[PDB]
C-alpha cells in the first residue's frame, strides 16, 4: 500500500539507487508491504530483492 | 556484515535496480544490517533508504 512517511534522520545516499533525505522530510513509501535486500549474484550483478525471498 | 543467502523463491525483477533470482540460487548479501524501503520525494525522485530512517506519518 502507498503511504506517506517522515524521515526520522538525514540520510546521504551511498549509491545511485539510494535517495538523499533530510530529517522531517515527507516521502511517498510506494509499497509498505515490501522491504528489500541488496544482493549480488555469481555473475557479479547487483540489485534489490524482497527480503522474504532469501534466507541464511 | 556480508553473508551468503539462499533464494527461497524465484523472483523476476520489476525495475532495473532489482535482480532476477532463482529458487536455491546462492547470493552475496552485501550488508545484512541494511533493510531498505523504496521511497519517492517531493521532486519525484525515487530511491532506496534504510527502513529505520523513516516512519509513519
Residue numbers in the entry:
A (entry chain B): 4 to 59
B (entry chain A): 4 to 60
Task: Show passages lifted from the paper.
During the crystallization efforts that led to the monomeric apo- and peptide-bound Nck1-SH3.1 crystal structures, seven more structures were determined that all exhibited domain swaps, leading to dimers. Dimers are formed by exchange of the C-terminal 25 residues, almost half of the entire SH3 domain. The interface thus generated contains a short anti-parallel β-sheet encompassing the CD3ϵ sequence 36KSWW39. Superposition of the Nck1-SH3.1 structure with the bound CD3ϵ peptide shows that domain swap and tight peptide binding are mutually exclusive. The C-terminal half of the SH3.1-binding sequence would get into steric conflict with the second SH3.1 domain in the dimer. Indeed, the hinge region varies over ∼6 Å within the superposed ensemble, and the distal loop covers a distance of ∼8 Å in the dimers.
Nck proteins are composed of three N-terminal SH3 domains and a single C-terminal SH2 domain (reviewed in Ref. During our studies, it became clear that Nck-SH3.1 exhibits conformational diversity and can swap half the number of its residues to form a dimer.
